[PDB]
Design a protein around this ligand. Structure first.
Ligand code: I9O
Ligand code: CA
Length: 223
């Protein structure tokens, strides 16, 4: 997250870190056994780390649970990033408490202008590289479809939305991939892509979660 703020420990209780020897992606806990992330975060050997603040220090609220199955969306295209969504099932159910909690799926899509919270352990620099230990947060509005399409000619599908600031300075970034965009207490987006980070006229692009609720629910119901 570039241009954000320190969230505060366990203030984003649905935020997960995906770990394969190191943090490599975020995700969102959606029930005691399932995490939503980006399809571009797929790899084998995932350990889901819940209750994290400092990802380099065991602070006492963590739960570390290995993935038993990952399911990349059937229509994910890794070239275009269309349908950039994945489900990860935990080997055992997370213990839910104030600091480890699931985030509700949307019942309806969110409109341009809606204020959201984006979070992660990604790069905090727009030029250069610095990776934080503690969770970073950014408040950002959803941008209009027309301005998203203007920013990224030929690249925005109906399964994507832009959020952030056309002036630059505030954005998600590398390492935030797969993490949450939460608006009015619902998971509306997944950190998907951009062109660099925090550049003028290049806002972050997010997977449009509301389009996938049926798929998520029926996948969970049979897996
Ligand atoms: F794993 C990487 F690094 F190869 C990768 C591939 C595709 C996408 C991404 C995530 N985006 C990075 C740029 C950006 N700018 C605003 N948001 C993002 C997220 C990472
Ligand atoms: Ca920790």
């Amino acid at each position: 997250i570039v241009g954000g703020y320190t969230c505060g420990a366990n203030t984003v209780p649905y935020q997960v870190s995906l770990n394969s020897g190191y943090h490599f992606c975020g995700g969102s806990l959606i029930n005691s056994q399932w995490v939503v992330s980006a399809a571009h975060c797929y790899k084998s050997g995932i350990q889901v780390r819940l209750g994290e603040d400092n990802i380099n220090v065991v602070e006492g609220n963590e739960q570390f649970i290995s993935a038993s199955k990952s399911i990349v969306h059937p229509s994910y295209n890794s070239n275009t990033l269309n349908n950039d969504i994945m489900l990860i099932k935990l080997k055992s159910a997370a213990s839910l408490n104030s600091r480890v909690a699931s985030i509700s799926l949307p019942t309806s899509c969110a409109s341009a202008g809606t204020q959201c919270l984006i979070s992660g352990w990604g790069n905090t620099k727009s030029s250069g590289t610095s990776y934080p230990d503690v969770l970073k947060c950014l408040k950002a509005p959803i941008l209009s479809d027309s301005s998203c399409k203007s920013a990224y000619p030929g690249q925005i599908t109906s399964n994507m939305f832009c959020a952030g600031y056309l002036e630059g300075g505030k954005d998600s970034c590398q390492g935030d991939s797969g993490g949450p965009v939460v608006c009015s207490g619902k998971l509306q987006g997944i950190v998907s892509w951009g062109s660099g980070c925090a550049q003028k006229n290049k806002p972050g692009v997010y997977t449009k979660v509301c389009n996938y609720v049926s798929w998520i629910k029926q996948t969970i119901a049979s897996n």
